Amino acid sequence: MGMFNMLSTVLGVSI
Amino acid sequence: GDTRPRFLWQLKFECHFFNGTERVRLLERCIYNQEESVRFDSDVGEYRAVTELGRPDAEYWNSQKDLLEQRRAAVDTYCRHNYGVGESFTVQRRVEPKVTVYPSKTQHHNLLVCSVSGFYPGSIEVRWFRNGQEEKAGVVSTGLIQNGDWTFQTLVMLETVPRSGEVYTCQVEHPSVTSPLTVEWRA
Amino acid sequence: EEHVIIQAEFYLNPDQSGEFMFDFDGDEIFHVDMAKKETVWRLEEFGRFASFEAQGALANIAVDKANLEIMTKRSNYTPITNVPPEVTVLTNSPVELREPNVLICFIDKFTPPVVNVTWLRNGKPVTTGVSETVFLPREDHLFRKFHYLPFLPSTEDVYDCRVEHWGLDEPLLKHWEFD
């Protein structure tokens, strides 16, 4: 079985 | 009456494949309240802001040398990889259609309906012949309809007052059959 | 192009709910269920050819919620403007008396992704064996959703798909009956 990969969301800029 | 305001953030990573995995392109998109704000396009290799809202994030993410190296590479690590995984049951999925013909009326018969059900993938050609002469005008269709469960359907209708002695034939071609399907509707 | 594969996630306040799913050419491959914290395949035969680590999807959603609060503030708290759905009811395939079928209620071109859907047989709500897809993506960033009701078609019965959404004045009733 192949394993699907995903992409990781990264955090935006806060103030 | 639940009248509270809503705030919505949606992310899409699209992998676009042209001619197999020969050319692949990635779009990472960040969308606030149905407006795209920042985007990463494999063809650029940096984030660009799309609206003013996105400028902070694009500048910030473009500083993370690590992040950028990772995404540029993603067309290998993510897109081509996943294509591989699913290819066998998504790309190569074939499900032959069911074909029915039947008469009808219009909002004594005036309509011959040719129904094509439960096929995959979506692209299909449906044609009407009177005896052997393709009928082009007076065909209307629903267009291609997607059911949401990895099949499609379509209705292709033909406005005719069938004369008796004539044979109407609906002919379907689809990537799942190596020879066209037909259904006759005589007199 | 030949094909597209979309990893699509969202987070919505104040409802505090987010989905994560994969789409191939407009069909759902799988989603992750935030509740039961596991992966749900759109068809059984998929889950026996490939698999996906559900954990990482939660990771993404937590991030997404974080970002959503950042954007809400950055936008000076301006909220989404509702787009009401359009709805058609359809059968799976041409109906024959006493062979199983499925009524499809197709809800399309709406936002935000919160919609209340109820089936009605001769006017009474019915729920036996009904099912739904997740909110599926569109290129315009609106959503699609499918609602399903398996049924034995008869002369007797009429069916209705009733759809409520923030963008609609009164709810939408969409009618269907054996011919």
Residue numbers in the entry:
A (entry chain CCC): 2 to 16
B (entry chain BBB): 1 to 107, 111 to 190
C (entry chain AAA): 3 to 181
Copy text from the publication.
Fine mapping of the T cell responses using shorter 13/14-mer synthetic peptides based on in silico binding prediction (Andreatta et al., 2015) was used to isolate five HLA-DR1-restricted epitopes for further analysis in four HLA-DR1+ donors: M117-30-SGP, M1129-142-GLI, M1208-222-QAR, NP302-314-DPF, and PB-1410-422-GMF. The most conserved epitope was PB-1410-422-GMF, with complete sequence conservation in 41,104 of 41,222 sequences (99.7%) from strains in humans, birds, and swine. Indeed, V-gene biases were seen in response to several epitopes shared across all donors. This was most striking for PB-1410-422-GMF for which more than 60% of TCRs utilized a single TRAV gene (TRAV2, mean gene usage frequency = 62%; number of donors, n = 3) and predominantly recombined with one of four TRAJ genes (chord diagram; TRAJ16, TRAJ17, TRAJ3, and TRAJ30). Similar to our observed patterns in humans, responses to M117-30-SGP (mean, 22.0 SFC/1M splenocytes; positive response cutoff, 20 spot forming colonies (SFC)/1M; and double background) and PB-1410-422-GMF (mean, 38.7 SFC) peptides were weakest, whereas M1129-142-GLI (mean, 211.3 SFC) and HA306-318-PKY peptides (mean, 298.7 SFC) had similar frequencies. We generated peptide omit maps, observed density maps, and conducted atomic-B-factor analysis of core and flanking amino acids to confirm that observed core 9-mers matched those predicted by NetMHCIIPan 3.1.
